[PDB]
Amino acid sequence: YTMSLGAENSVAYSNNSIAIPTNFTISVTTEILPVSMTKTSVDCTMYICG
Amino acid sequence: LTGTGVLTESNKKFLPFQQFGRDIADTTDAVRDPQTLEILDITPCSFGGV
Ligand SMILES: *[C@@H]1O[C@H](CO)[C@@H](O[C@@H]2O[C@H](CO)[C@@H](O)[C@H](O)[C@H]2NC(C)=O)[C@H](O)[C@H]1NC(C)=O
Ligand SMILES: *[C@@H]1O[C@H](CO)[C@@H](O)[C@H](O)[C@H]1NC(C)=O
To answer: Burial of B41 by CB count in 10 Å (0-12 exposed, 13-18 middle, 19+ buried)?
Structure first.
């Protein structure tokens, strides 16, 4: 299928209407970031030749 | 099949037709002794960086 980018949402704009929230939600979300790699070393002579 | 390593007793049970053993990286880590049919575990000699 041809993918859909998202649901249509026509915001009810006018020149004298405002939307004010009457409530709120406390949202907690995760963000995962890699920090470090595995530290490796090579004995180059031993790898190439043994 | 020659190499350098530390030969130690092993709990691995080879099938009777197998002689050598390899790990996921295809390096010989276990060998069956041809004289006495006992499986010997090969550990590389403990190298390191100074
Ligand atoms: C704001 O939203 C919260 C929920 O996020 C509302 O709290 C709920 O209220 C209903 C009915 O009053 C209860 O049945 C729920 O158990 C409540 N949930 C929680 C988590 O407390 C709250 O009433 C809303 N306030 C306004 C003014 O709309
Ligand atoms: C080879 O000689 C050893 C020496 O004791 C013996 O134990 C073994 O049974 C012989 N035969 C084979 C097939 O290894």
So the answer is: middle
